[PDB]
Amino acid sequence: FVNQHLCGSHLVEALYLVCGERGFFYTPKT
Amino acid sequence: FVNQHLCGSHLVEALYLVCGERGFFYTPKT
Amino acid sequence: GIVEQCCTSICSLYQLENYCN
Amino acid sequence: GIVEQCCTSICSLYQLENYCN
Ligand SMILES: [Cl-]
Ligand SMILES: [Cl-]
Ligand code: NA
Ligand SMILES: [Zn+2]
Ligand SMILES: [Zn+2]
Hints:
- The complex is a heterotetramer, with 2 copies of chain A (30 residues) and 2 copies of chain C (21 residues).
- Chain A starts with 7 loop residues before the first helix and ends with a strand.
- Chain A has one helix spanning 8-19, and one strand spanning 24-26.
- Chain A is an alpha+beta fold.
- The radius of gyration of chain C is 8 Å and the shape is flat.
- The A-D interface holds A 1, 3-7, 11, 14-15, 18-19, 22-25, 27, 29-30 and D 1-4, 6-13, 16-17, 19-21.
- Strand 1 of chain A pairs antiparallel with strand 1 of chain B, so a sheet runs across the interface.
- It is classed as hormone/growth factor.
């Protein structure tokens, strides 16, 4: 796995790319 | 056919932008 | 489905809020 | 929030797994 500060169209696709076949949630609200 | 693994990467990317700060929930079923 | 709405059909920015929180 | 987690700080292979439904 890559260890970075996840931001940008770099992390979202990772959260998706990692979580895979299950699902995910995004909270822009802090 | 049409491949969704790929379709999602664009969708989720774009969604981030569009949904903005209110955030979003990605369910890979529907 | 959402992947059903933009895959076989392209969608525009407004038409994406339908899936936004 | 969560940004403080992975974008504010570096995230690992599982800290996001907490964020899956
Ligand atoms: Cl960047
Ligand atoms: Cl593609
Ligand atoms: Na990209
Ligand atoms: Zn970038
Ligand atoms: Zn592509």
